[PDB]
Amino acid sequence: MEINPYLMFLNNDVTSLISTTYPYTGPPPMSHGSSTKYTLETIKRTYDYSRTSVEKTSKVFNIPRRKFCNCLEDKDELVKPTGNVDISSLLGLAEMMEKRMGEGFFKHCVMEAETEILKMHFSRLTEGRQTYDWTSERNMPAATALQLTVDAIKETEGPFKGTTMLEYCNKMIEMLDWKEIKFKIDSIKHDEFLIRALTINTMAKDGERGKLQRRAIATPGMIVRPFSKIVETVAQKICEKLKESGLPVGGNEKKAKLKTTVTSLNARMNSDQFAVNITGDNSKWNECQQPEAYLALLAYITKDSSDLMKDLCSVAPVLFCNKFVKLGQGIRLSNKRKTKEVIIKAEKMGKYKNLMREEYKNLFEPLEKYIQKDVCFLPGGMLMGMFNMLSTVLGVSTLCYMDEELKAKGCFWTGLQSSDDFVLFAVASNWSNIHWTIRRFNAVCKLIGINMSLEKSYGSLPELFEFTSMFFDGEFVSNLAMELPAFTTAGVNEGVDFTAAMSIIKTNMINNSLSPSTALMALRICLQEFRATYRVHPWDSRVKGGRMKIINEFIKTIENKDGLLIADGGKLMNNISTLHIPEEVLKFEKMDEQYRNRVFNPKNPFAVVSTHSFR
Amino acid sequence: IEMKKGKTFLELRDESVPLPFQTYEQMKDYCEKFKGNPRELASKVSQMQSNIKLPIKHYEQNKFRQIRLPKGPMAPYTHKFLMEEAWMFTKISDPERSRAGEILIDFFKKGNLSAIRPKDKPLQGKYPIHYKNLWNQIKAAIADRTMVINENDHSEFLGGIGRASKKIPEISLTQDVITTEGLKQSENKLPEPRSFPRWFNAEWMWAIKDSDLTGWVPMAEYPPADNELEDYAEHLNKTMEGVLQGTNCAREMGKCILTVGALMTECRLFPGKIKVVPIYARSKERKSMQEGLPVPSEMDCLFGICVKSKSHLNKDDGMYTIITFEFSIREPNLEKHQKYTVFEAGHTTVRMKKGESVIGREVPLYLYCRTTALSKIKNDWLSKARRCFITTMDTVETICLRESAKAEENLVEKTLNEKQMWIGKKNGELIAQPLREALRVQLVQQFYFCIYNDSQLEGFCNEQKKILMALEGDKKNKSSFGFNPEGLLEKIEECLINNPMCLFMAQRLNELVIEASKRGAKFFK
Amino acid sequence: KFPIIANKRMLEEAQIPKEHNNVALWVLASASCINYWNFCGPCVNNSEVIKEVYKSRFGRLERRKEIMWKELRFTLVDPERMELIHALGGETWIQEANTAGISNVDQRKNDIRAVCRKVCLAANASIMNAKSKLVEYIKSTSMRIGETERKLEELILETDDVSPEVTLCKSALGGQLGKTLSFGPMLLKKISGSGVKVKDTVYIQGVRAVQFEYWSEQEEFYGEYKSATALFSRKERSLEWITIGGGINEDRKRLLAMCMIFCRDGDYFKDAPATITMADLSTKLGREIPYQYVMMNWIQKSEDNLEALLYSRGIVETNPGKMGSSMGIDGSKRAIKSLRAVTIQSGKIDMPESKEKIHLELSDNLEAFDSSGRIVATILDLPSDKKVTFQDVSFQHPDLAVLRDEKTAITKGYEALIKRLGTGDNDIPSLIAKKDYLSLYNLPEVKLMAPLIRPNRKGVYSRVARKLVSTQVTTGHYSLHELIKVLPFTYFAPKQGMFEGRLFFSNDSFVEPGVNNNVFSWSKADSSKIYCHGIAIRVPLVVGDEHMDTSLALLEGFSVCENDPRAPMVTRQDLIDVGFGQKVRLFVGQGSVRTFKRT
């Protein structure tokens, strides 16, 4: 006998079994690292996708500046990625989109973003995945580096009493001109502080479904953080009004958008015409996005608005036009038998270049020019997972194109675009004009760096396309974005972790990525994970743990075992229809009044605020 | 009110600008007054379209091809433990001694371990003496009622075989020193390619079988119910659990769980120390020898032992090392068992029914020695192996609702007991089974995914999807079209090395396209 | 060790000693400190404040508790609820849970149609008494329909809801019809034309032959399948043209296939598939079947059969200007290639209405005929028998329901065992006080329950049960619950063998002493009750100590004793080689361990 766990794909669909192809969600045990070699290859491919050779030495660093925008050369083999942008076409697409949506559209959006920012407290910056400290020269949460920055400002030139985003930004600006800056103790000069602020570090974390292509996800500092937040707020306020923008949210709304698009298409295209689909996948969405074009676009946007926003939105772009990249850990040496092994940093690899291998050498000499001490003065690109909203806006601009050359042939297109993944819908009345339309679309996309893959982009007739793991079909729309919690990594508190997991499961059910039985199994699994995390078990069990000895000793004094808490030898009572309801609210009237008041005693040494917190 | 400007910022802003513009003001004026001239733009896009040669294939005139696999020796076993060739001693479970340190000591008391005395000469191995002396030290430590090992001579060696050397400061470096020591950049090694494994099918089949013992995996309780939905869900979950728990895959799952639960604690409370840990599992019920029905029988089982090296889990991405001493009653084969050093440890006994009594038939006994590393992330990933059930559940429910919705009625039992699913080929002919029996295959697939998880597998799974969608389109008479299939074939062939799961899946996928050629027109032979 | 921080005065004011029982608890502190604080600490009364502050959550809980859960149903698409929409309705399923609105009419329609299907099926058990058994079932079936206790002899007429079963059962009542038809689950209707019956043959395996009938003239009809309208014309065993109004991918395929069978178009009416030759059985257990229903059933088995049928219909390449109204093999709205003589469109085809009532004539097979044949309904167009709980119903005539299952058999056996007590002489307590257990092994009720026992190994079960019975009687220490539990097995000669710990019936279920189970459970503080699948039963007597002595109902030749961890754990087999004065621990259930001593 033999086996083939794909034969079930013959007499069945794919929307029902595709999930079996990918493993279950969770932390990737791959340990995708951020080494120096990978970073250098990235920088090389970046400078290369720039099809130009022009430069201009600066005055603040005495360093060249590869200006890869509006200077296209090396037209040969242009099917491969490109980064040289054309401003004329960009502004033309922006104008088309404005005309379509409306005139005072960008103005209304920027006004909304402004007013939202005004009443915003700088403290918001504490909400972030991670950053890079410019004093300790490491990566940490936002709150830590924020405290560091504020206390350094205090130690050097008095405290920051703004308590608002705008004062914080202006304080950063002023600090750009300070000659001496202190911090717990040591100080630094102007140039070094500038560099540190414009420094970036490559993080190894890449956790998501689909593909973990984020080997070297960026990790900027704190100076540029607020301006990036502002630009993202504006781009978000913009993407909301756009029908073809699945970034800000997903699921129910996403399916609504899909079906709306499809139905509008079916009701629009003439009888003679016939549609098609393409499963596009933009390649190198981070090594071809330039902040200079973003700057010009933001300028064209705010052209008619308060000059405040005009100058503000023009901050993060220039901050990204000049971004020093921290090279990872330096190379190591070794003798033949490997009995001795030397370790050197990156800044000195230019000192022993004669030893490194060729592949590592040819990848290092051409860049030595741009090196200063240990970093590389990258004048462009976009590595961070930032400006995703803005990139999506640019893509939507790409899709809203239309001229008379197409109309004459009776053809057009439309579709949807995520950050770096999209779906196209072409229309024509011949099995050839479709090819012409596809080539036209690819050309307009390449004009502004937006490329497309060929080994990962396919197509088919109208019924079958894929978008953000949501394999759409004539029916049976199947999702695959099943998320889950993780206690060991995020032990916020005993009380709040189970309720949060219940809310998460409820959400996943809403998005149809989960079904009743699946949800129940996941619940019974997360309960056990929680228990094992906090080292707690029920009372029926014959455990001998440290919390358990006292819990087993104090069990005989109560009868409302049902009312007991999971954290205290309790049992489950919630179910599908009782997720929004915390177990506490569900056991209040049931807990023996003694235990109840003994828990809800605000006169204790320490979501329903329990006497179960881990400060 | 306005954003008070500095100086350096303004200089940069006037510097970092497009080519023809050298000041923010010129660019700003050009932008705020940009007008639309669609004619020049159309000419530009047409010029770009002309100087581009975008190919568009239809998969019919230019079909796919069979994949070219690597060539060389067969891929060996990779997982840490043993699945099919394993063996275990048994004993009754005491809730007062339900811990590894106690279970191991109890197993040792009866003196069945002390009888394990491997001879000097092995069958196939590298460093037999170290393993043997370490086994003796393990027995000595257990006798002393402490799992610790004081002397650090063998463990140090076997942990340093990977990498161990001196380090010279860069400041103490010159050119003459270099020329003397012949220092160079440390060459980076690549994984060697391997061939197709010819033992995966056997393990899969064995896993599909039903185990004698049952209850390997523990689970939580079932909360109350308040309507028909929760009742149906509970019924389905109970059915699926009762179907799976008595499978040999569940045994390995529970074993991994209970062993990792102890290793994650030993790497936490005794870091930098050498400890001893068992490889055990716990059962709760069996099947009568006179009747094929279940019977309550709580019991413990010991498959082998795992030693621990110094583990701090805060440096070197939290890499640590272990050493495995597993039991087996099946002599090895040279290919599948390459990383294993083997011995012959006396004999043992096998027990089987005889009418109304039990008997015992002696057999030989083998000891499988192997070294391997781990990390914190792998621990967190294996401990969460129960999630495999969740994935299997989804597949079942996908089939059990769609149909139920086409006919608008409960068809759960009907489909589970009737709906036939292709599972494999026997004697050049397909084999089909009910869904209730294919759950096992789905679960084994998810488990193997959970084990051999790695970047290679990520790429394979991310790429095969396109082939699957193309095939589906072929089935339903849709002119699938692409741009560069051969490039995709290369993308997929480049990620095939020293990972048997990917190789098996690739071979079976080729077989699938072959079989479908009888009804499809997008694949070569 | 003590990561959790705390306050100091808050700790001392509560008098929290460290290492209470070797647990430090602690400024810093451990987590167990929280357990020690919530199990033995100060007492407040702040419940009202908590409720007021968390009013939104507790009002949500109240609302939740204010629900009347209803049934659910699998189907597709052709604020206070938003808090629960996740659990109310998905996409393949949905639950009709309601809050305040009530109207019981459509559920009543479902009930009446289900019971009509049931009864009409029940009448399919003979060859001659079809109509008679049918009508007698009707007259013997009453219901608490809605709120009124009505009979099922007037509802079928008073109601106006077309269906195969309604019609099939009302024709026997000489009731009015509406000119509607039913070819399987599909609903048809005539528009124009007419014809006459004609016979033809069809081969099976290429050698045999079977006769079917059809019409030779032209005639137009109106098909209507779930979420799909249609119109077509049949001519000489073949489908000429057809048009579909409302589009659903799955529905359009099944509707088209059903209309084709209705037109018998295709080559599979000349020859047959190789799957039919596997059976060639166009027959029931003892009845005949046409070719159309056999083909249909063959479709229901798998969609591959549907695809084959549709391929039998010619497939061609669509021409320009027709994509908008073309079709695909999978129901695709438009495609380069479609099938011959097809037309898709949007909007459901308005269905006509016939205001002319008639009466038909039933046949041996209950097939009704209005005129010129033209069968309108039959049992062949029904689903397979589907067991469903019926309530608000009364069904008196035999064949009403088998009402016989092993579970119910065991329930009745145990009810009889319980009643036998009867608080009198020649009953359980008298034999107990008399110490005459042998008679217990001869009662009638145990003889009635004996057939429910696993036969292969009943001797050992009887041996063990008699052992327990005698050991509990002679000594006078016993427990009626476990006794009655094991009694049904004390009716066959005792034999040697291996016992495991469970007594298995013939339905693969089981029972176990010293433990509880769904089939049989009981507990102290409610000893006057005995649960059977949740069905609480009463004891004709009262006891407060007759049950308290279970030291001998767990094992056979042993007795419980005081707990002792030193005693070694064992199994049920090695018990034979134990001695006296030798305590032993052993599992008595799930994670339930107890100590025992011989005798």
Answer for the pair B475, A11: CB distance below 8 angstroms, yes or no: no
Closest residue by Cα to residue A217 from A414, A46, A360, A385: A385
Measured between CA atoms, how close is B355 to chain A, in angstroms? 33
Buried b (16+ CB within 10 A) or exposed e, A62-83: ebebbbbbbbbeeeeebbebbb
Resolution value (Å, 1 decimal): 3.3
Answer for the pair C77, C111: CB distance below 8 angstroms, yes or no: no
Residue C194 sits in the same domain as residue C335 = yes
Owner of token pair 């590869």 = A66
Residue of B187, B391, B426 lying closest to A19 (CB–CB): B391
Q: Do A525 and B389 touch (CB under 8 A)?
A: yes
Listed in sequence order, the residues at least 6 apart from A325 whose beta carbon sits closer than 8 Å to its beta carbon are A39, A43, A199, A200, A202, A375, A376, A378, A383
Give contacts of B12 with chain A, Cβ < 8 Å: 60, 318, 321-322
Q: Do C249 and A595 touch (CB under 8 A)?
A: no
Alpha-carbon span B278 to B273, nearest angstrom: 16
Interface test with A, best of C10, C30, C38, C301 (most A CBs within 10 A): C38
Q: Residue type for B423, please?
A: I
**How many Å from the N-terminal Cα to the C-terminal Cα in chain A?**
59
Which residues, listed in sequence order, are joined to residue A414 by a DSSP beta bridge?
A425
Residue C536 sits in the same domain as residue C553 = no
Provide the residue range defining the domain that includes C275.
180-347
Answer for the pair A8, A17: CB distance below 8 angstroms, yes or no: yes
Answer for the pair A277, A465: CB distance below 8 angstroms, yes or no: yes
Residue C196 sits in the same domain as residue C341 = yes
Residue C509 sits in the same domain as residue C519 = yes
Measured between CA atoms, how close is A100 to chain B, in angstroms? 14
Answer for the pair A288, A82: CB distance below 8 angstroms, yes or no: yes
In chain B, which residue's Cα lies nearest the Cα of C64?
B226
Helix (H, G, I), strand (E, B) or coil at C90: coil
Residue of C50, C85, C336 lying closest to A274 (CB–CB): C336
The DSSP code for A277 is E
- C neighbour chains, 3+ CB pairs within 8 Å: A, B
Phi, psi of B308 (to 5 degrees): -120, 140
Q: Concatenated DSSP letters for A200-221?
A: E--B-----SS----TTB----
Q: Do B390 and A521 touch (CB under 8 A)?
A: yes
Residue C261 sits in the same domain as residue C146 = no
Closest residue by Cα to residue A460 from A488, A423, A485: A423
Interface test with A, best of C12, C34, C343, C593 (most A CBs within 10 A): C34
Dihedral over Cα of A137, A138, A139, A143: its sign: negative
Give contacts of A590 with chain C, Cβ < 8 Å: none
Q: Do A334 and B512 touch (CB under 8 A)?
A: no
| Angle between helices A225-241 and A388-399 in degrees, nearest 10 | 30
Residue C329 sits in the same domain as residue C408 = no
Residue of B233, B384, B478 lying closest to A516 (CB–CB): B233
Which experimental technique did the depositors report for determining this structure?
cryo-EM
Helix (H, G, I), strand (E, B) or coil at B417: helix
Residue C214 sits in the same domain as residue C162 = no
Residue C322 sits in the same domain as residue C253 = yes
Closest residue by Cα to residue A26 from B45, B383, B421: B383
E strand or H helix at B226, and its extent?
A: none
Helix (H, G, I), strand (E, B) or coil at B255: helix
Tokens representing residue B89 in the block? 């001693």
Tokens representing residue B13 in the block? 């802003």
Measured between CA atoms, how close is C21 to chain A, in angstroms? 8
Answer for the pair A168, A195: CB distance below 8 angstroms, yes or no: no
E strand or H helix at B319, and its extent?
A: strand B319-328
Residue C499 sits in the same domain as residue C590 = no
Tokens representing residue B250 in the block? 């569940």
- Going from the C-alpha of A100 to that of each of A103, A294, A605, B244, the distances in angstroms are 8, 21, 61, 57
What Rg, from alpha-carbon coordinates, does chain A have?
28
CB atoms < 10 A from the CB of C316, how many?
A: 12
Q: Do A606 and C7 touch (CB under 8 A)?
A: yes
Give contacts of C18 with chain A, Cβ < 8 Å: none
Alpha-carbon span C501 to C589, nearest angstrom: 10
Alpha-carbon span A544 to A530, nearest angstrom: 18
Interface test with B, best of C311, C500, C592 (most B CBs within 10 A): C500
Answer for the pair A80, A444: CB distance below 8 angstroms, yes or no: no
Helix (H, G, I), strand (E, B) or coil at C313: coil
Interface of C with A in 209-268 (CB under 8 A): 249-250
Alpha-carbon span B75 to B337, nearest angstrom: 10
Buried b (16+ CB within 10 A) or exposed e, B113-143: beebebeeebeebebbebbbebbebbbebbe
In chain B, which residue's Cα lies nearest the Cα of C495?
B356
Alpha-carbon span B483 to C94, nearest angstrom: 43
Give contacts of A597 with chain C, Cβ < 8 Å: 43-47
Give contacts of A91 with chain B, Cβ < 8 Å: 31, 34
Owner of token pair 């047409």 = B46
Answer for the pair C563, C597: CB distance below 8 angstroms, yes or no: no
Q: Concatenated DSSP letters for C142-168?
A: EE--TTS-EETTTHHHH-----HHHHH
Q: Residue type for B382, please?
A: L
Q: Concatenated DSSP letters for A55-109?
A: ----SSSS------SS-----TTTTS------HHHHHHHHHHHHHHH-SSHHHHH
Q: Do A603 and C42 touch (CB under 8 A)?
A: yes
Residue C552 sits in the same domain as residue C524 = no
Listed in sequence order, the residues at least 6 apart from B341 whose beta carbon sits closer than 8 Å to its beta carbon are B122, B124, B125, B126, B127, B128, B131, B368, B369, B370
Q: Do A30 and B454 touch (CB under 8 A)?
A: yes
Answer for the pair A67, B15: CB distance below 8 angstroms, yes or no: no
Residue C201 sits in the same domain as residue C334 = yes
Residue C419 sits in the same domain as residue C528 = yes
Buried b (16+ CB within 10 A) or exposed e, A453-464: bbbbbbbbbbbb
Q: Concatenated DSSP letters for B132-180?
A: HHHHHHHHHHHHTT-------SHHHHHHHSS---B---GGG--HHHHHH
- Going from the C-alpha of A220 to that of each of A31, A169, A388, B292, the distances in angstroms are 21, 16, 16, 64
Answer for the pair A195, A63: CB distance below 8 angstroms, yes or no: no
